[PDB]
Amino acid sequence: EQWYEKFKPNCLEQVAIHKRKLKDVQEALDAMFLPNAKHRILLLSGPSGCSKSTVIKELSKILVPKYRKVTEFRGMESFSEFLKGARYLVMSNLSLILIEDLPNVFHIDTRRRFQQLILQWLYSSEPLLPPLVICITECEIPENDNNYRKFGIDYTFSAETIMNKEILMHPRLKRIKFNPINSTLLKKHLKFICVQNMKMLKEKNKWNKRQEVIDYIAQETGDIRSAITTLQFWATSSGSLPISTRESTISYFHAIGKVIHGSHSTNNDNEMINNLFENSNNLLSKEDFKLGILENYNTFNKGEFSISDASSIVDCLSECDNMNGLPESNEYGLREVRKTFRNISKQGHNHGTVYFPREWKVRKLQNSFKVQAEDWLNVSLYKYNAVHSFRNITLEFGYYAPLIRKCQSYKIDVVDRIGGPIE
Amino acid sequence: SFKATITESGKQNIWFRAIYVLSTIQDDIKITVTTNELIAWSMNETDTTLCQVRFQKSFFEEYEFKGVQVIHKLYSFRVNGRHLTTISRGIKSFTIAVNRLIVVIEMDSLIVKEYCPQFQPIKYDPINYICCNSTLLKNFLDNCNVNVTDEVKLEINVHRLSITAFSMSNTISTLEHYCLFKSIIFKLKDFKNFITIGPSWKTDNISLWFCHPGDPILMQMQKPGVKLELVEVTDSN
Amino acid sequence: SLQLPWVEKYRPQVLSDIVGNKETIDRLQQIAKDGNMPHMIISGMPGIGKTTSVHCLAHELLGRSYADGVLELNASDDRGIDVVRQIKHFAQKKLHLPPGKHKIVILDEADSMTAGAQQALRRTMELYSNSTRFAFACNQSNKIIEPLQSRCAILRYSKLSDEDVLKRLLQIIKLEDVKYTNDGLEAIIFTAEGDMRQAINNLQSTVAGHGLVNADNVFKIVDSPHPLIVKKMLLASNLEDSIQILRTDLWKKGYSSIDIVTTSFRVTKNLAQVKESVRLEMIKEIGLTHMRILEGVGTYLQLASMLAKIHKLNNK
Amino acid sequence: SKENLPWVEKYRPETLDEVYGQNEVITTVRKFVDEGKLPHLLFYGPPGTGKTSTIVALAREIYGKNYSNMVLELNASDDRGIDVVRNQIKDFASTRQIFSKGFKLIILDEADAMTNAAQNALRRVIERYTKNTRFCVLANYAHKLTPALLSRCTRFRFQP
Amino acid sequence: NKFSASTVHLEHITTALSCLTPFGSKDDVLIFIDADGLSFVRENNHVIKIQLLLSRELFMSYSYRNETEDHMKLCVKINHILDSVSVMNRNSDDIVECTLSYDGHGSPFVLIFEDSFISERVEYSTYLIKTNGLELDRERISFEAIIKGEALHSALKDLKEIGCKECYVYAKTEANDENVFALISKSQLGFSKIKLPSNRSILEKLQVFDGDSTTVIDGFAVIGFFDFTSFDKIRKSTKIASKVLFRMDVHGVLSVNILSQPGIVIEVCMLEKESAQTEIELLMET
DNA sequence: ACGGCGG
DNA sequence: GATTCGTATC
């Protein structure tokens, strides 16, 4: 049929996966096939076409007939009925259950049901359970049709957003992140396919010029399936049809690094910025990206650059923060940051490591402070007929009121600085 | 090749109810075809339940017979349950025949309705005894909601038989053929449907064949021209 | 009341009448004959032949079974996850096609589909790949999720050149025996800006209005692309000429100030021969002017001030 | 009757004769009407230039007494979401025109306020039922309309 | 009062209102007041129109003292009327005498409910008027079928249960008494057909003409491609229909005439789609 | 007359 | 995209 379906691996050695990752997956899987196995779930996450399920199928074609099929799901509570009958696959029915089919997680209700049902699976009191494996493909979700929801699963389709922290942190859940197929494996396999089609490629007179495309494809995509599809399309072609492969999305920190340091592929700042906006406007249009720029522009040279440049960068960021959510604001801010870091960049710089903004922690602390202040206010209102504005609680009482209400206690009420101390 | 006709009221009702239960077990209901019987059956996503209903040639006014798999020749095919459950939903002559299935409906008001549902050829995929009455289990099971109770316990004793849908429970005094020659747990969304197929052709005993907790349990009912079979898995350990 | 517009009257019916993308069109014809058409995603800009090529491919491939073989779904039709769960019965349908032929599901405007629909389309494309094939047609390929693009062969249609527009215009003219001159057709191509549909519409309007396709008659009913007038205004040396353009060719012609500001933003993004610092300063000034326009001050003085600031940051 | 109306509404043109200032577009649309073929039009210009008047007078010289059964006028005062486009406009376009005055007309006044989803869905209603219907789009700001919609519409600019 | 009508058989007007619900449930309603009777007209998307008529004989008193104009037109919303009469029918078992009233342009539509103890009075606000162009040509009928109400209602219910995204109608009368009338549906099941019988109790009369309603010919069929969204608007009216008359001309307008048992007369006009024809012919020759 | 067909 | 650790291989 199709090369990515006709040349599918028949053994693990034909699977395009790294040796160490393969070892980790193998040992984890075998440990999940033990009578009382610490780990109940195996959440494999990664980009598309990284042999996430290919390797699982091959491994369950060996492990299953050793301690005992893959029983794949077919995507409100239909998944409940499926999993209500996916637990009887016990010994003599041990059949690694693979959930590559995700019950619709773009819908709030069945997303919560998916999460709260996999939790019940995690906390099940049954003494014997089948090895549960979930494959989630990390793919940025494009810009919708004006969707004003703009929720978590409306920006990125990732495990973190489908599952809840507890699910992903549960001691009995093992997560093995997957990486794009390296060019070594990609060339090694795209050449095996060519020594199986050297006949047609010879009569086509492309068998001679095969390693050029085998290398260009291996350098353009980490997707094995897309690589094989592009190879099939080029081989069956006649003329000099352009070799185009699928397009992948950059990461958040990848985009930050591109803005700060740049990209080797392009030494043009304008072209790089325009392409980043064109292909990635679902992240370059979120305030967290500008917060990341502010938090990580000091990771250039480990923070050993002029103060004038830092002042210019932060001043521009502040100016663009009052330009509303306009498209020009980000295009100005990122361009200014890149220009500033381009003029000062040289050779000999041991750049630092970037980090995610801590604004979420500050917001959580603000919420905690609010919760603290409210108790003080109502206590006063019921015990001293006292109404105090939250502004005065945050500027005067938060500090004086607990000091007095504790010192008088020193000789129901608050004895500690409202919202914790200032450090 | 195939031409079958149903020309009675209760027979149409049993056909409808069996078709709906097969449709609610699997989206595509599976019908195989034999020169002496008509076999309809379904499957589950996790391969747990197996409900099969067989219609003998005496159940139809005419049963002429002239993909194909030999074992006696046998045609097996798949057709959508939800589509064909509305066709079988007064009727004077219900004719079914055969790349799309052919079914003819002739109303008592001389209205003839024609449908052409598409079908896909496929291949055929073929202790203690309890003979409790169907209605006693019916009244209890119709009082159990699938959403709130999922499993049913079948504890058989020589003194009495008590069934618990779990913890709503009911007890039936010992039953006609309680041959022990125990405890069994299985699902409920299909048991109620299976026990409610039979009581549609009014003119009523269910047979429970189970061996071990890890072995499947078989349900059998008898009709003058209809055969009923259900096999469900039970928790191994 | 019986004539059809030239855009639809002369829509190609065979792959040989689709100008441009020579290599892509040749590949499509080869797929039409050989068969075994892979999953494809056809991107590009408006008016290039992304749907006139997928429909022609489906015609020349399925042929007589083009009624039970081509399940066409587009934005005008509902395409929720429920629809994707019409796309399943069509795939499960068995039709006796010639060897090498497969059913085609033409999902026009796949960039507007919901993500749940795409996540289910993956299931359909995985379980029924041996009987039916999917032909996505879109304007921006990034709107299709990466797992779907992984299973498909991406074919990007480039902008139609002036020669492939002139050749099709000459064909249509010879069929419609209209009168022309070289300068008129050059102006039609110039205003088309790589759009075949816009070129046909402009030619039809010029023929209807006057009859003779010359430069004057074309330009008195079709205006020169305003992005190019914005670019001319932004690249002026002194402020006199820039403000002069802004007034005569943009304000007195009826273009809205907000349109001018948005076009200026895009022009600046794609501007050449300008330093990066200058470009980002101009972007900032254009953003400030956009802010002022959106707040209510849609006046010519704001645009004049923006051009003055741009000149000020150019000359230093 | 028409003596207690504001002068802006009392002096609304009723025929294409009374629309002044815009000569080229009026001449072109008159020739289009006479020739019997009317393409998908798009009228662009500053407010109060005579776009609504022009299209309404054109649809009165194209239909007549059946200007109420052949023309479907939707504007910003009406909901024009994705459901509206998929149902009301689609059913108006699919149905037959009782043969009256050839094709039916759909006037989308103030289309710049329409959401992008509706404009994207209207693309395959404009170019599928072009044999029975012709769409007219009136807008003051062209940046709010999708480029695909601009591609399939003939642009006429209403000068000040 | 320029118009006044009184009745106690409120079930008739209730059925009139429930037969007007299918044509949208929150929109404007046109009421035409003339000496002959009381008529409600509704139009949806310029593609389908209903016209119910309550004759003078349904009211003991029907004055119509208006003299300046022969007919009076008023536009009132239907959601207001529905929401009012819904709570008024709470005690419908009482002997209620409904009284319609209208004093002319600018005056509200009054609807008084007197139980001999309580006299509820409601004044419905009248809106400006935006409905005849959607009428078949009487000299161009291509087929004329008279069908029983119960059979048509059952067929429509079946088509609803099958989904029936699109619908087709057939009208062929062959040389003998071979009156063929069928309602084909394009549904999930595929190509489903509901054939009305040729017997005279269900199909009283089928006559196919050459677009002139005068020349009868056999062997030729008239095909109508209708959207079932519009075709289901007559189901609620056929539910109470004794006999249903179907008429279509070559311009693609289907006029469903429903008569109830005197009762109420319902006229539905439906437009035909642009448009499978050979598939229709091949399925019905088979 | 009772069972089935908001985030 | 950067650093740091760890291989595998020529």
Ligand SMILES: Nc1ncnc2c1ncn2[C@@H]1O[C@H](COP(=O)(O)OP(=O)(O)OP(O)(O)=S)[C@@H](O)[C@H]1O
């Ligand atoms: N050497 C190879 N190793 C692995 N997979 C291969 C190889 N050659 C061909 N393939 C095929 O490439 C495809 C890879 O699919 P997978 O990566 O397992 O699915 P996936 O990771 O979920 O990708 P997405 O996100 O679903 S599109 C399968 O269809 C394989 O059969």
Ligand SMILES: Nc1ncnc2c1ncn2[C@@H]1O[C@H](COP(=O)(O)OP(=O)(O)OP(O)(O)=S)[C@@H](O)[C@H]1O
């Ligand atoms: N390659 C081509 N050769 C000749 N005419 C073409 C070509 N491409 C488009 N056209 C004309 O454009 C009209 C059809 O437009 P389409 O090809 O469907 O546009 P499109 O490429 O699909 O852009 P979108 O996605 O619909 S905005 C007809 O008038 C065709 O004659």
Ligand SMILES: Nc1ncnc2c1ncn2[C@@H]1O[C@H](COP(=O)(O)OP(=O)(O)OP(O)(O)=S)[C@@H](O)[C@H]1O
């Ligand atoms: N060319 C004209 N000749 C005569 N009166 C005109 C002309 N243009 C506009 N008017 C008058 O101005 C009024 C408003 O113009 P309209 O055509 O109704 O609206 P418009 O010009 O389309 O502007 P917008 O975009 O709808 S706000 C009309 O009712 C006329 O009275």
Ligand SMILES: [Mg+2]
């Ligand atoms: Mg996979």
Ligand SMILES: [Mg+2]
């Ligand atoms: Mg297109």
Ligand SMILES: [Mg+2]
């Ligand atoms: Mg207007």
